[PDB]
Amino acid sequence: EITCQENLPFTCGNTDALNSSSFSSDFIFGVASSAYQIEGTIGRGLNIWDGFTHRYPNKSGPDHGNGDTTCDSFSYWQKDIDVLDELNATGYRFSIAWSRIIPRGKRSRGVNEKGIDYYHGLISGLIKKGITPFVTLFHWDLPQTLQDEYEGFLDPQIIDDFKDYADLCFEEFGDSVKYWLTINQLYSVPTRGYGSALDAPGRCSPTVDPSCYAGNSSTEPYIVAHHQLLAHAKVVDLYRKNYTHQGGKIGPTMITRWFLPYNDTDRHSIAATERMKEFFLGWFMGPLTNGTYPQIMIDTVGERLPSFSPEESNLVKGSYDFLGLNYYFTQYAQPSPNPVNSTNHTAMMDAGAKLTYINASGHYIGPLFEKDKADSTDNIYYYPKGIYSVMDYFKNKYYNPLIYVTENGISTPGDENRNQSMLDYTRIDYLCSHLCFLNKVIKEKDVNVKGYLAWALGDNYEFNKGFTVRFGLSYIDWNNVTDRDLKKSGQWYQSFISP
Ligand SMILES: *[C@@H]1O[C@H](CO)[C@@H](O[C@@H]2O[C@H](CO)[C@@H](O[C@@H]3O[C@H](CO[C@H]4O[C@H](CO)[C@@H](O)[C@H](O)[C@@H]4O)[C@@H](O)[C@H](O[C@H]4O[C@H](CO)[C@@H](O)[C@H](O)[C@@H]4O)[C@@H]3O[C@@H]3OC[C@@H](O)[C@H](O)[C@H]3O)[C@H](O)[C@H]2NC(C)=O)[C@H](O[C@@H]2O[C@@H](C)[C@@H](O)[C@@H](O)[C@@H]2O)[C@H]1NC(C)=O
Ligand SMILES: *[C@@H]1O[C@H](CO)[C@@H](O[C@@H]2O[C@H](CO)[C@@H](O[C@@H]3O[C@H](CO)[C@@H](O)[C@H](O)[C@@H]3O[C@@H]3OC[C@@H](O)[C@H](O)[C@H]3O)[C@H](O)[C@H]2NC(C)=O)[C@H](O[C@@H]2O[C@@H](C)[C@@H](O)[C@@H](O)[C@@H]2O)[C@H]1NC(C)=O
Ligand SMILES: *[C@@H]1O[C@H](CO)[C@@H](O[C@@H]2O[C@H](CO)[C@@H](O)[C@H](O)[C@H]2NC(C)=O)[C@H](O)[C@H]1NC(C)=O
Ligand SMILES: *[C@@H]1O[C@H](CO)[C@@H](O[C@@H]2O[C@H](CO)[C@@H](O)[C@H](O)[C@H]2NC(C)=O)[C@H](O)[C@H]1NC(C)=O
Ligand SMILES: O=S(=O)(O)O/N=C(/Cc1ccccc1)S[C@@H]1C[C@H](CO)[C@@H](O)[C@H](O)[C@H]1O
Ligand SMILES: CC(=O)N[C@@H]1[C@@H](O)[C@H](O)[C@@H](CO)O[C@H]1O
Ligand SMILES: *[C@@H]1O[C@H](CO)[C@@H](O)[C@H](O)[C@H]1NC(C)=O
Ligand SMILES: *[C@@H]1O[C@H](CO)[C@@H](O)[C@H](O)[C@H]1NC(C)=O
Ligand SMILES: *[C@@H]1O[C@H](CO)[C@@H](O)[C@H](O)[C@H]1NC(C)=O
Ligand SMILES: *[C@@H]1O[C@H](CO)[C@@H](O)[C@H](O)[C@H]1NC(C)=O
Ligand SMILES: *[C@@H]1O[C@H](CO)[C@@H](O)[C@H](O)[C@H]1NC(C)=O
Ligand SMILES: [Zn+2]
Predict the structure, then answer these.
(1) Domain range summary for the chain, segments of one domain joined by +
(2) Could you tell me the end-to-end alpha-carbon distance of the chain, in angstroms, rounded to an integer?
(3) For the structural domain made of 1-499, what CATH number should be given?
(4) 314 CB under 6 A from ligand 1?
(5) Could you confirm whether 407 is annotated as catalytic?
(6) What is the rounded distance in angstroms from the CA atom of residue 53 to the CA atom of residue 44?
(7) 264 CB within 6 A, ligand 4
(8) What angle do CA 105, 182, 223 make, to 5 degrees?
């Protein structure tokens, strides 16, 4: 019988108690990263994250930091492989920058051979060290030209352009890459990029944020989500029909969260909690497992929710060999009004729920995850059991899928000096507490999880936060980004992997 801790202090950092041997022999352990966050603009075209961070510096981060140079993995990709080698990692998730291999967006306009070579070298180097690549085709960095031509994912033209880009990737790298991720965190771009405008492209309704250049927070998130599903499905169909000879697997990446009732004895809070599961997870998992959106969304969103044609529904349903599940935290849910007529209405309000990290009785869900200096009441707290609950939910609600945890990590303040940043015991606690519960859910619920990739191989540009927070298991000096030194967490993970 496995027992896991939910509150501080944690003792899972002791590799004698918890290590890789606790998992199945073939279980993959590694770290993850994304192109915009680690490469730099050198050698590639411009994408919407370059556009967004430059047009709206205040939105790029409190420090106005962006991905211009960041950790310079373009030049130091070998250093990334060295970190993985040091960790004895068996997996590494990275993304291909669409702007690096097809700077002009549309494949017919030509490809960047040097960009293709960049990834060939990285992939070859990973395989030579016994590291299995998990490659994300689209980690939000859409070529700026496509956003300017037809507003990217807001238009159906994105489907064919994304398909042509994915085809190039399968053609060029598919002989070595056997695990593909289509779109990173399906829920994110529609809501943050077209709803709240916290992320690129930065579209929203005029009254939601006057800085948005255009948009409609009430309708656009649904249009974008719909196109993401169609684009994703078209790519999976292409992969399974034209690249089955490569013997690989492909799937979408879902940002997952668990939800608990703000008040567990209040039917309204309980209902809000179930609505959240449908609006947050079901929005994409419904189409992916059934070819239709959840009924609660159909009823609530009405005319603003696009419909799938029979052909599209068939294309989207079952469009995955596995699911890349990102998990960070859990929230309490309570009812909230949905003012559809208000000029400031957003798609996110449709769930009819308010989210918090503190319940009705004043209980904080778990240890501190992220401290918000602007407002103490806006701090994020984590919940280790959430990963158990999410995995259990996916197995029982979504037809026992093959799962790879594609992201799981925690940040530490950017204000900390080198020594403080290196002594990241809070990261060891976060990672081990989640790994404990992951091992527990695999054994108790028989969830088909076959890999775990911790977020951020090293410190990089963090979307919306610039360099004010660090997520890496390896430290990076911004005055000399060459080195990738394992922090205490990286050293612990090394021991966890090879006890
Ligand atoms: C997994 O996918 C399944 C489909 O492959 C889902 O089942 C479908 O669920 C649909 C509801 O979402 C359901 O469609 C409704 O059918 C009503 C009856 O239509 C028949 O009878 C009519 C007699 O007058 C006739 O005119 C029709 O031609 C049909 O013969 C219909 O009245 C409904 O329309 C109203 O409600 C919808 C909102 O749901 C409005 O959009 C619409 O304007 C109207 O107000 C509705 O029809 C749909 O209307 C919209 C239109 O775009 C669609 O084409 C049209 O179908 C449908 O019958 C079933 N299909 C099957 C095979 O059962 C399943 O949903 C779950 O299970 C169903 C039974 C139901 O309980 C849902 O609430 C559940 O979510 C999906 N499962 C999951 C997990 O999501
Ligand atoms: C988690 O949710 C539950 C269920 O909603 C909360 O319990 C409910 O708390 C209500 C008070 O906010 C209770 O209603 C009140 O009852 C007294 C006594 O009769 C009455 O004088 C009040 O006017 C009020 O009555 C309601 O008024 C509005 C009407 O629409 C409604 O029909 C009336 O009932 C309610 O009885 C109670 N439900 C039950 C079954 O216990 C719960 O609130 C916490 O516990 C209750 C018992 C009370 O001590 C609250 O002060 C306390 O916050 C809530 N838990 C938390 C931590 O918020
Ligand atoms: C976002 O787009 C929606 C849909 O075009 C707008 O909602 C429409 O608003 C008009 C004017 O009040 C109504 O006549 C329609 O019935 C609404 N459509 C539906 C079914 O919601 C909404 O106003 C737009 N929001 C902004 C701020 O531009
Ligand atoms: C807020 O969360 C706390 C912690 O989960 C809940 O307290 C637990 O409630 C159960 C059921 O009554 C008790 O058996 C446990 O002993 C409590 N644990 C603790 C640490 O107190 C509390 O019920 C939640 N509040 C609401 C309204 O949902
Ligand atoms: O559900 S969302 O659409 O908000 O996306 N969820 C994310 C999870 C999350 C939210 C807030 C803080 C930390 C993590 S978005 C989150 C943004 C992080 C900062 O750039 C980034 O490091 C991480 O890879 C990414 O998943
Ligand atoms: C208050 C503040 O400092 N933030 C402003 C914001 O109000 C403004 O809409 C935006 C224009 O792009 O520029 C930001 O710097
Ligand atoms: C790994 O953890 C297990 C408990 O799950 C323990 O029995 C074993 O001794 C540990 N391995 C090492 C080498 O410490
Ligand atoms: C790396 O892991 C393999 C497989 O568990 C093990 O045999 C090997 O000794 C490890 N190498 C190091 C130096 O940790
Ligand atoms: C597979 O490739 C062929 C040759 O380019 C193409 O004709 C066919 O449409 C492709 N199948 C798809 C789009 O899945
Ligand atoms: C506009 O939206 C904001 C954010 O949800 C909300 O706080 C405010 O009350 C709304 N104003 C109106 C029109 O009620
Ligand atoms: C930058 O760091 C590298 C690796 O530690 C080192 O070799 C080089 O001398 C440093 N350059 C500077 C800033 O002096
Ligand atoms: Zn710049």
Answers:
(1) 1-499
(2) 21
(3) 3.20.20.80
(4) no
(5) yes
(6) 16
(7) yes
(8) 75
